[PDB]
Symmetry: C3
Subunit: 117 residues, 3 copies
């Protein structure tokens, strides 16, 4: 069955574990709501952070989510772009879905709304 990436992006106001995890959870919850995603259908997830965030792996937020303890995830550094959005967390959630590419609901929150296409 076909697989598709779902993108998310958000921002935090400060580099703290509380804020990174809160904003990451809110971003995940929104992706799950808009795409009706069940954890068993998630192939894997990639989270990234800009290099001004160091307090915690955003992946930690994934176990705040009931039923998502078996979803494999790893956390990379976003490319450091001159004048790029600061304090930014992104998600690439790869899922089994029949929803067409045009209809996948990518999610941009907080100051990352500027990254919308």
């Amino acid at each position: 069955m076909m697989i598709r990436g779902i993108r998310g992006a958000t921002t935090v106001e400060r580099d703290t574990e509380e804020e990174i995890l809160q904003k990451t959870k809110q971003l995940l919850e929104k992706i799950i709501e808009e795409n009706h995603t069940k954890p068993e259908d998630v192939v894997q997830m990639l989270l990234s952070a800009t290099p001004d965030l160091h307090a915690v792996f955003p992946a930690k937020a994934v176990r705040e989510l009931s039923g998502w303890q078996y979803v494999p995830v790893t956390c990379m550094q976003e490319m450091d772009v001159t004048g790029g959005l600061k304090k930014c967390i992104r998600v690439m959630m790869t899922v089994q879905t029949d929803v067409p590419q045009e209809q996948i609901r990518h999610v941009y929150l907080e100051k990352a709304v500027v990254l919308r296409p």
Copy 2:
């Protein structure tokens, strides 16, 4: 139908938006030419850049490909390997395909030709 990763790598001579966008675009076009890839069959793409490149996200080049506006992409920092190739942009394009693993056509351009297996 199976999913397969297609790898690309290229280089720029300088850290400028024009160079990054043109060279990323050309790399994507070459991958698309050699593998006959249609955007609807692309699960997601991951782009990376060595930590000497900062001018622009290479993903911006993807929006210059007509029809590819719904392909999800994210960027990341490539690891900094001592003696590794400088000013390097890489692609992992994940596609649905029946082409056997050994027949997938991975693409190496510019100074990256030295990375070719």
Copy 3:
């Protein structure tokens, strides 16, 4: 069948090519053993390293695995997290498998055993 990610993590004591390749090869072989993985069923692999490792791309270890020469791989920098595990190498190996999400065998070796959930 479905597509699923398999996670691995390990550590090295020194930033040298010999140790990075040896510990990476050992981690890959353990993942392969526990999951019965054949190279042709691997969609692609992502390797990451913390920013304190520079001697070699861990991907080089994949090429000393007989039969794995056509598996696409790329490397990236792990997010730098304060107090995180140092000298850490992770893999995300995407495979076609019938194994349920909760029965995939993720692998944690050396000092990364602490990451085991």
